[PDB]
Nucleic acid binder design. Sequence first.
DNA 1: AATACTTTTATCAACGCAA
RNA 2: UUGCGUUGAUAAAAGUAUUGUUUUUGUACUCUAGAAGCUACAAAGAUAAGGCUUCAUGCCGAAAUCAACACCGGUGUU
Lengths: 183, 183, 836
Amino acid sequence: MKINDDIKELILEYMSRYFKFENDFYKLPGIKFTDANWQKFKNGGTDIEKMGAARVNAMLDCLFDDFELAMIGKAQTNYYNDNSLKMNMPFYTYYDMFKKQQLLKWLKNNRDDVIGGTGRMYTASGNYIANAYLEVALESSSLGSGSYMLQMRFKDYSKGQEPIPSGRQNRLEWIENNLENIR
Amino acid sequence: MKINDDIKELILEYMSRYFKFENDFYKLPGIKFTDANWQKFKNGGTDIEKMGAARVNAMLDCLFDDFELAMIGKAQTNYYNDNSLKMNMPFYTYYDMFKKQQLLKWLKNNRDDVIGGTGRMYTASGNYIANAYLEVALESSSLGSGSYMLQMRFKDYSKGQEPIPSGRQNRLEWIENNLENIR
Amino acid sequence: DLVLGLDIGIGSVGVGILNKVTGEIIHKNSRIFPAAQAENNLVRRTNRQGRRLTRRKKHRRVRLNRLFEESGLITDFTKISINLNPYQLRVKGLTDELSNEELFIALKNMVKHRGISYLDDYAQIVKENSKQLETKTPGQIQLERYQTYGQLRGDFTVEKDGKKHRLINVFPTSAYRSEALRILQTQQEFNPQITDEFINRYLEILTGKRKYYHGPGNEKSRTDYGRYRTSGETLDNIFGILIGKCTFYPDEFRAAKASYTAQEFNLLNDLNNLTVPKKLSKEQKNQIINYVKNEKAMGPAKLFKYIAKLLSCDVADIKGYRIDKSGKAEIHTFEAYRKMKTLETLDIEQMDRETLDKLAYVLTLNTEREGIQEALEHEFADGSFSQKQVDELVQFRKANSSIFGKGWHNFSVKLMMELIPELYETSEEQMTILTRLGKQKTKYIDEKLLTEEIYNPVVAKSVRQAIKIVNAAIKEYGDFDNIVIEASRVVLNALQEHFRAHKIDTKVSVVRGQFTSQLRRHWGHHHAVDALIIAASSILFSYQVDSKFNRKISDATIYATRQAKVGKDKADETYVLGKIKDIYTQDGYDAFMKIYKKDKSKFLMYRHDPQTFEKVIEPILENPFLKYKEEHGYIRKYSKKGNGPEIKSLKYYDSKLGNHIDITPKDSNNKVVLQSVSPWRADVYFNKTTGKYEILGLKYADLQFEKGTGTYKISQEKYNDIKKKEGVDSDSEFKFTLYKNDLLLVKDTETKEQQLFRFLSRTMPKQKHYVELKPYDKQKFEGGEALIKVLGNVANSGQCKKGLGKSNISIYKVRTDVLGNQHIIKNEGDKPKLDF
DNA sequence: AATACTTTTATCAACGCAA
RNA sequence: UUGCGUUGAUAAAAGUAUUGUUUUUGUACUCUAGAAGCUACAAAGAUAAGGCUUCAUGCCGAAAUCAACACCGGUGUU
């Protein structure tokens, strides 16, 4: 894990994904910006390499799961060792590609083990957002009291007004047919 | 994972585990201490919550693997939510218990893909340590040229003065035989 | 030598104990519980069988999609145009060719609205709206309504060339089947891929309906609300297990009133109660039974004439008969046996006796064609009933609704077969024969027998709480000599049967409240000392805790929000909207003046269309909306020529946004919320670093059914999110949890003062560690009453809301038993319970 | 959420007739 | 207290219809082919947050039960 400006663009992109109003994100406990400091941080003003470690590691944890903070280090490892990837695209597009490849390996090797559900995210006033993302886990890596060790977090970008079905078979089949509308 | 007073103690304990001199640790280019500030950090004079993000994550990235920060997050959840765990041990003892639990759960289910190897941790002297930790990893979660997705490092606390048997089957039999000693 | 006295009220039960010699007061307390109002299971049952309609509507659409996909007509269902007119496509495709996508939109709009089916002031309007179906399909009716009046759906009045009347979109479901059959026959003549199995499967999708005696479920779904039970069985009629049991054999089902045995018993008991100047013998009884059996026309008059000629005296001498409303002679005949002799295809004369009892069980329970046609297969012998016989008894039971819809006898056939040989010879009633024949927890008293015989829902809860108080008292203070109490006779008989079968005599008695009011007038906490008065004729509190987890999480009403600046805002804030419906109504005009006087710019119309707000400002000034309605029609919008739309409603910025659930859709533009979210419990934490308590707060909405197994829990990461919000540090330690009506002790540490309250909730979610407290001794906490030195005063309204993150307090949890003996704890467990 | 329609089973009350 | 016969209330459970609230899209109205998203109408999606397997006349989700812990329906104590 390294902290640089690519992590700032990744934080800004995923904040733009899960939160419709920005006031819900930067006023969370642990992050706790003001409006002037947010308009300074968002507009390239203040450095991220010199910020507090607790504030950066609280911004990284609300948007990524505890397993998705492992694929950021491996994405940074394979991204700073290839001239064919640095010039073409930014870091978050490669991160989305990495996450989708690991999902494809999950669906190939361990297809009768993949479970999922709707996730809810807590905003800056405590009132949560029902169905903020779609969480996808491996049931063999269950841990205890409803927490999983291998877990991912997607979001659907679909045009048809038809929600994701419930049950293990219908949800797995929806994920298999719509493997392009999730980022 | 959070950054608080119980992360500095884990960093200091793992530095005392892996490096033979402290001067090999705090002069690495990501960390870059001086001998006054290192004793100020080692004695409790500074705050780890307000330190620079790149330096703290560089320390945590040098000492730990990319997969074990996920285990740090999960262990922090289980550790802070329970009372006897909080008030009967330090955090690094429960972290080693968590690591051993996951290792035995790894060997119990599918032991045919567990492989191991030697570890070479670089220092600030040009040389390094040829064998300080033992790597154990899963063959199914292979990424690229030499990268593994799921991986952990252990240390041998045996007092028989015997070297590591190289090869897959013998090392698997040795780590299964010595399951009560390594931490 | 102790006396127990109980005061059994609506929402409280008082209890006292005396010693009967010295008269000292041993114990006195009061149990307080909520009253079991019957309005809550009505809301739960209404929403339970109101979600099934939505579920089956959606499943009709799913089955239609699978039908189109399986027959090969449409492959993918993404590019179907939302913005066509379905009614024009229905009326057009009666005689033309629709190209596999217009047919989909037509048939889907058909199955989204099918009609009523019960017809095989509201019925007068369906009578008016059904005469035009003699020549037109409902699609034609709705299309002419659409292109004549503009408006199609709802119920709406309109003025035609003749007279003002009413239009309603309800048509019977026979016309929808006829229209769909014509459409599919024409499209089968055009499209040769519509098979006859396609149109049959579609027509079973359209007009399919379960029956009222079938209930929910499937062969493999196995719900316990209809048939197909979870025990592996399968009923025929889900009301066939609700039939009550016999009076003297509590394992036998009752007998049908129109069986052979019930009518034989009723006639043999009807004329043994008849005294003739001295009772009728066995021979004349067998003769009159054979005379009422073999007779085409019997009655109550010809029976009296026949007994008058059989004993040869007269008719008016006889006394003992059952009189009627208007004074006559009423006596049982074999009415269902003489009526069942009018069947030409099946002969009942040489048919068995038990077969005449199963034929009345089937014809008494089942009322439809499919019920009787299905309940003649499993019960009876295989065969034994031809199809013409089955149809003739189906139209027989449909023709006689008053005879077979009477009900069920209060005895069984197994018991009534033990008296019919007896009341032939010995001329007696049923009661003397049953008297001369005699048919009729190990330490504590169980509640299953006594709540079984209470049916008022307010009384049964009080009865069970009094039973629990009695069980706790005889567990604590040995045994008594008197149990005096205060629907009423059955607990007397239950306690008497309990103590009588246990070979220990205690005087259990009731007393009237007028006597006790007389005692209070004569002799000179409200339930306690009055229960002591009850036990004298011969404190502590115990509340009931509310700890049920799945309750109403929020409203079901969907609200719309907008981002605006109303009044004195510096930046854009989110605002919950409202709506004035039916402006012409008197309440709509009073509400319009209520919004209009305090703020003019709260309306959305004033900010976006101001020109037409200079056409609503004149009828409120110089004319109020109902007068303009009857004068010129509705208050239309602003245009150059008078073709602007009408005005019936006005939406406005109602309020600011507080507690909610954000249920905004995928492709939305504004935030869409659910309001009125309620709290459940609170967890109490403590840290030795600062030395003050922290208090979480959970809601009903924070838990969910989880994603792999379906168990109801809250995970640890979401719990840590709620811990981070509410100000609880991560190295605090967990003390206990508090539900509603739990007793909470607050003790000061500097000057050692103690009070204890009841927990209510965790109000004001802007400050931290604020908690609402209810009083211990009373039920109102009214006034500006003072408290201990650290908390303060009760507020002006009567609501105690205190921030318990103080610097000197200490907090304990009190667990009172049913008698009120308080046990004070300080540390419940290692980890709060999250999995249920 | 909130009005229209259909059906079954059970339990109390109140009056009359045997006890 | 047991049986029968009428008329009144209550309770529990089941099967349907039409709307109401809200989101998007289309036409009309308004201002200059664009915008505005107020006022109408018509479609399509949702309707306590959510979840399941049996793949379908599919199913569950707003009631009641309540002092805890320890020892073999009973026994002990803050």
